[PDB]
Structure formats: C-alpha cells, structure tokens
Symmetry: C3
Subunit: 336 residues, 3 copies
Amino acid sequence: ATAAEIAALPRQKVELVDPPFVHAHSQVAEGGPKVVEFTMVIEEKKIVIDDAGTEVHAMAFNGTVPGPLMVVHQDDYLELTLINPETNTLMHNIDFHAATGALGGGGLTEINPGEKTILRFKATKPGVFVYHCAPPGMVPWAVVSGMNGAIMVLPREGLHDGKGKALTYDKIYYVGEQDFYVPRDENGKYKKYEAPGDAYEDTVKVMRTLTPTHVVFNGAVGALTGDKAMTAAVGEKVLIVHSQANRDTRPHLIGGHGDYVWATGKFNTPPDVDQETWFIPGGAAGAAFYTFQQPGIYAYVNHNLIEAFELGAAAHFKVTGEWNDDLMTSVLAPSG
Amino acid sequence: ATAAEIAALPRQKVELVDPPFVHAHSQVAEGGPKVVEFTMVIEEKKIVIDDAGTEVHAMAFNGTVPGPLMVVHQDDYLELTLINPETNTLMHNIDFHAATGALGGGGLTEINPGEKTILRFKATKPGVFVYHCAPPGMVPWAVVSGMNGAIMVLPREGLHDGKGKALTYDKIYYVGEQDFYVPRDENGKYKKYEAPGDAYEDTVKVMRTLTPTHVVFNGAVGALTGDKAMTAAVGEKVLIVHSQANRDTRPHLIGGHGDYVWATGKFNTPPDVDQETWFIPGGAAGAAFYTFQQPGIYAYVNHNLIEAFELGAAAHFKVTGEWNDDLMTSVLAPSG
Amino acid sequence: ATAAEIAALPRQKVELVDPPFVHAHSQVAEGGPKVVEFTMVIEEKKIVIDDAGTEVHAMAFNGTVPGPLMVVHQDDYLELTLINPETNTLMHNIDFHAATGALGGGGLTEINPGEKTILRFKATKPGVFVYHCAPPGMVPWAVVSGMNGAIMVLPREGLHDGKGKALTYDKIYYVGEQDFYVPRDENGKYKKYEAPGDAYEDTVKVMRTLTPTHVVFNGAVGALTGDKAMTAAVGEKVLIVHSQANRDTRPHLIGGHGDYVWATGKFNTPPDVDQETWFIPGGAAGAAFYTFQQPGIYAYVNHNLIEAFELGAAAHFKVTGEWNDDLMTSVLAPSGT
Ligand SMILES: [Cu+2]
Ligand SMILES: [Cu+2]
Ligand SMILES: [Cu+2]
Ligand SMILES: [Cu+]
Ligand SMILES: [Cu+]
Ligand SMILES: [Cu+]
C-alpha cells in the first residue's frame, strides 16, 4: 500500500492475556487491514519450575513463560511496543518468525535496560509462528531461559480444511513448551545463583549436552495439570496452538486425536488429518483442531514419554458431558 | 450405532501372529461393519537384546516385543480381551491411539495380576496407530520395557494413492522399533536383575539421559536378520508398517525407496511419494509401500546410522529375482 | 531401455564445483535423456573444523565436506567414475539414495586404495537425495567422518509448485550439514591423532552418546560466513538444498522464510508453503525456495539454537537492495523510557 494508505489504516490497541489463554479476537477478520498494537514489558525473575524448588533466572516477555499469544489477521500489521525496565540487567530484543527483514525484527529492537522500542511489521503469511529474544552472542541462552512465545496470523476468512470447508473453533489454548538446562552440583542437586549472569557458564555446559533437565508446559512441571487443567465439553471444537522455540516436540492428546493438524503451523499448507501424534520441529509453532467426543480427564503430552512423565511435558484437559458407548465401552470391567 | 445395533453385528475372531508377520486379513472390507475380536495375554519375561547377553525385563503383549499387529477396517469395532496372568507382578493396561475416550482405553483396562478385561472401541479413523501400556505413575518405564505395538485400520475400499488410484500390497510386514535404557556398572558392563522391579531406579536414571543404550527392531539386535530377514521378489508390492511408541525414528530402505509413504500413518492424509528416508515421531506409526525392482540383500534401517549400526536398528530384506541393468549397472567393476 | 539404446544416448561430461556452489546446469532439460558423467577422487585428509584449530581425519568425496552436488534430470543416467588413490588406507564405496539396487550402489563400488570403479544408474525419481560412503562394519564412522554429499534430480520440466505453476530459481546453493564426534581429554580439550585409525575407538564412544561436539555447514564452524557468506539481492529467487546424512536438522532463514519447501526433498511430493522452520530427517536432503524481500544480513541456521550458535550450525546471507518499510519498520528506535 502507498504511504498515505498505510497511515490511514485504523490502529487498534489489544490487551494481552497470560498463556494458556488467548486475548479476545475474531476468527473471521472484521473490516479491512488494521495496525494491531501490543505492548509487552520484559521481566527478569527467578521462577520455580518443579516440585523440588528448582530455580531458573527466567527472561520473560510480559512476565510469563511462554510469552503471550498475539493474534492478528493476514495483511494486518503487528505493532509491538517492547519495554526493558532499568531493573533488568541484560539487553533484550525480539525476533518474529512471522516477519520479514532485519533478523525478524531482532536487528531493530535491541533495547538496553531503561529503553523501549516500537516495531511494526506486515503479517503477510497466515499461520502460527514462534517469536523469541535473540541478542547476538547469546541467542540460545536467552531462548532456553524462557524468552519465547508465538503469534497466530489467521487467514482473513478464518480457518478452513483441505476442501475449503470452514473450521470454526469454540475455544483456543496456547501451550508453549520449554526446554530448561539447569546446572547441578556433583551431588546431583540443582544449583541456585544470585544473578542471571552468574549461571551463564554452567548453563551453557548443560546446553551443549543437548539434554534438557526439564521439559515443561507453561513454564513449570504441572503448570497445566490438576486445578489448572484446560477445559472443554463434549461437542466443543478446540484449537491447541503449541510452540517450541529451540527443540523438537511431538504433541499427542491421550484419549483424543488431532482431527486437523497444521503440523508446520502454516495455514496455506493443507492440514494433516486424524493424527495420533504430530511433530513440531524446534523453532516452530503448530496447531491442532479437535472436536471432543468423550468426557473425562485427558492428558496432552510430548509423546517422548520420558520427557512427558519424567521431565515435565504433560498437561491435562478436563472435559464435561455424556459418555458415548458406541465409540468406547468396557464390555467386561477388570475382574479376577 | 445403538447398543442393540452393535449387538446384532457379525463377530469375527482373529488369531494373531508374531511380528513382523501380520495375521490373515482382507485389504478391501468383506461386508459391512463387524466386531473384530482379539485376545492377548501379558507376559512379563526376560529377553536378551544383544550378542553380549544383555537382559531386559520385558513387558510383552502376546509374549512379543513389539506386540502383534491387529488389523480391522474403518468403522469396525475392535474388541480386545486382555489378560494379566497370576505369573505377573505388575498392574497392566492398554492405550490404543486409535481409540476415542478414557485415555485410549487405559482408564478402563487396568488389570492386576490374575485379572482380565474386555474393551470395545469403534475404529473411526483409518491408519496405523500405536498401542501401549500406560500404568499411572510408570508410563515411560512400561513403554520402554517393550509394552507397545500397533494396529492398522484399513479404509473399507483398501489403500489408495493421493489421487484415488488403488494400492494393493502382496506382502505386509510390521517392524516395531524399541528404545531400551539398560543400566551399566562402573566398568561399563550391563547389569542383570532377578526381578523386574529391581531395575526400576537404575533404569529411570538412564531414561533421564534421553540416550538409549540400544535401539532395536523386533526386540533385539539382529532380530530381523538371518533366519528372520524379511523376504520378497522383484515385482512384488510390499507394505512396511513401522511403529515407535517413545522416540523418533527415520526409516530407510537401503537400495530401495518408499514409493508411497503415509509418514503420519493416517490414510486420509495423502502419502508422500518417492521417499528416500521418512520420519516417524515418537508415539506414532507410519507405513511405506514399495514395489521391489532389484534382487539382492537390502538393509532397512533407522537412518541415524549410529542408531542403525552401533545401537542395533537394522533389519534385512532378501529379495529374489532378475537383475535390472537399465536401473543400475557396474560399468567398470572395482579394479586397479 | 536396452544396452543398445543407452549406448546411443548423448554423453555430457560435467566438471564438479565445490559446495556451496553448484555446477552449471539447466533447470528445464535440454533435449532427451542423457548419460551424465562425473568423476570424483576420494581423499583421506586432515581438516580443521573450528577457529580453535580442532582437527578431524576426514574422508572426503572430491576433497570436500560435504561432497559436491551432482545435478541431472529425471530419467537421465548418472555415470560416476569413483577413484580411491593409493595414498589412502581404507576401502571406500558409494551409496546413492537416488539409485535402485545393490545397496544404492554400495554393493558394486567397493574399491581398495589404488582402485577405481564406474557405476551407472537411472535417476528414476525427481528430488534431492543424499549420497554417502557405506563400508560394511564401519558405515556410521565413514559418514560422520564427512563422506557424504547430495545429488539433485530435476524434473525434466524443471521445478513447479504443488499446483502446476513454474518455479524458476535465479541461483542455487548446497548446504551440507555435518555432525562431528570429536574425542576430548580429561581437560575437556579436543584430542589430535597421528592416523585416522588411532581415533576410531575414542570416536565410537562419542558417537554412542548420540551427541555431536560440532554441527557444521560446509565442513567447519563459520565456513559460510565472512567472505564466504552466501549472497543474494532483493527480488532474487534462491533455492537452498540442504542435506544431513546421519542426523536430523531443522533449517531456518532468520529474517526470511521457506516460501516453498520440499521438506522430504522429493519433487513429486507437493511442497509445504510459507515455512518458518522446516525439518529434514537424518539420511535425507531437502530444498527450500525463497524470494528475498529485504536487504541486510540473514543467518541460515539449524533451529536447535544450541546446535546453531554453540555447536556451529549457522551460515550467513548478505543481501543487497532497498529496504521495504511496508514489510517492516522501526516506528521508534531503541530509546530511553
Ligand atoms: Cu528463530
Ligand atoms: Cu500414547
Ligand atoms: Cu543411506
Ligand atoms: Cu531477552
Ligand atoms: Cu504394562
Ligand atoms: Cu569411504
């Protein structure tokens, strides 16, 4: 569009919500292209990531791991105000895999503590995409300290299957998956550090083994289980967006399926169907659409079951409604 | 269908055979929906997995690693009688990735030793699917002790390519790939245990490294070589089902291809074609269709070659027939 | 085709070029099927794989890691003269994933030092495909010693997207990604060896961890950076062929995309589109097509960022041209709150 045309576009401020929840949005675009405005403040803070009091100096967009899901439509502009308070100790920036140019925005958004920046980019490609911090010389460390999230760029006409039939979800959740690499002393106990930089050398040593100590959803072991399970009802259509900025994952809904799965996360690539377990390579986001058919507790996992059940990569859905004996029935219950 | 309608459907009792062979079945569905009945006894047994006499306490559906392939058609009912003998020591159950509800059947099939159960589920989705044991609190341990297999849910009109052209195999083989995590002593010799539970704590430590000590086909190094090499002839169309319940794999037929590969394992997702090496994520099954064109020895491997030739993920095919010099000829044999 | 019909086919002798460059070729086939002839000499040679001076005894097709990209069209015959000079100490062979029979040619190309062989195969399927050495009993050691490359079998009508539209690249690069497993001493410093065989047992131990010490493009940390950076211009269409003969990778162009990606490497399988990060399993090649829209530096990486930035799997593109503020603009440059 021409300079005047871009300047004339409506500007809309959106308030973000913490994962796994997603801010208000419409699936079908309302009106023509807009400049959708978001603000995130960066927080450096100690978080506890397991039941044994294990700490990480997190680097968190909007104070959360993962950072929040930002939702726009194709050919909207995403305009992010990014703030790095003077209480932080590191330079931070942002790389949007959805964006084109300047290392995804990373080269234009390098902000020291006490600085802010505003980046605008045109969301030319429909899909879910990773975003992450990427300070030159320390890229992986920032990313595995939790400084990553995702955005969704919806097609202007909403989602469709491979045959052009509309796929309209009733709810959407965003599951960000994080590999953490926590140093341990020679006794096997996880170390703690006073300042974020103090952990740098010990952490990189663990990173180089390529073996995470923890693999978690929403920033901690059990963050999406128990009373923090995600919810649905029988007949409800659910979109599950899943990201991993650094390492491969293989999501699986135990008791369910991915009816339609954009495994690559890109909406112009037709979705796979009837999936048992899908695969999202490190550095990407994917999305799965499922209509729930049975009530009960489901587990949603990375189906390397060691990562799921030993390292933390397991969430739950609690689903209300009536049981379908046609789909499944216990013909003879466990008996002597 | 109503319970009454289901009750009135034909029953067919199937007799299972040990992998890599697959029980007698039709590719095209013979008549309307049936209730297909299978029975499996759970055998906790010691298996030797390598030529060094390394032992695993296996947890084995039908006495094998992997468990046998069950074949039904879409919208059939799979009715499994699962038996846990008094000669066992652990609670076992079954999760069918093909099933909808109750953790794939796992919540409804928990049998203590001396108990049995009968689960029925509607096979609504066509494809190959993993099944595995999943006892709450010990899911990865059960799975990496060999308690997994796969089923095939065929389309009622049999297999087709991406454009609806029919694909009929002459032979079918089921390769179950297994990652084992065997503890070692301080000299690097593998440990032996006199009861399954004795290995638990040691085994969990190895599992947490995410690095298998062995990666094997059909339960042991060299299992599908020599007396167990798969066979075919030039001109023959072969389907190779491959599962991995816990860890990624990348099958490759050395000297051949995957002419058609349902890499995600799901038949409503069009297959990839002309594949050199395909990818199956942990927690999934896939299938490749190939027409042999050359005689001789072929190796079928996980194409991480360290996994194939150091850790044990290699099978052979012995193929009879006439050499084709158009496809390949030695113009000058190795010479000075 | 009969031996007589194949004898009647034209011959074309191709001079190979070193990666990441690709020898002259035509996207759309010129004429009917031909016998396309290549020669490679295998070199066992010491190579340096990082800025610290870490050495590997490499086993190298045409003297480079990766070996060079051979380009033919579907239904051409690729005829390779492979030479194992007497200065080498191991038997070598070649397995073409593109080929059908005799373990991809491995069974028919086993040459001791001082020997040569000529193999011909019909390139029946279009795509990019790995080739690698595979001597029985030492297969992964040969491969992770650098003895692998790729070929491209173009469709006779060139590349097209999943819907019949012609895709014509302006330039092509071949990025071979290599996992190395280098033994360390008790200091944690990389060990050097007098002869290739001296390193075997220590190397196999590292290999068994399934954890490479180095993951590199074009044979070394930073090999495709500085004056060796790949180049493009705004508006230019680039095909990037990427191979990994042993271990998975997840390519990503930082600041760009894969507009069309044959993630499986096979051209009869329709490409994925608008990709951020694609996935190529160990034992395969893939190809990505992109039209550059913005000038400046880009990094092309394996998006396990530890692999990219700690272990060496990062290359650079330098792109010339005019910046597009519609696509991206700094509304407010970094400035005090
Ligand atoms: Cu990135
Ligand atoms: Cu499962
Ligand atoms: Cu190979
Ligand atoms: Cu940061
Ligand atoms: Cu079990
Ligand atoms: Cu070799």
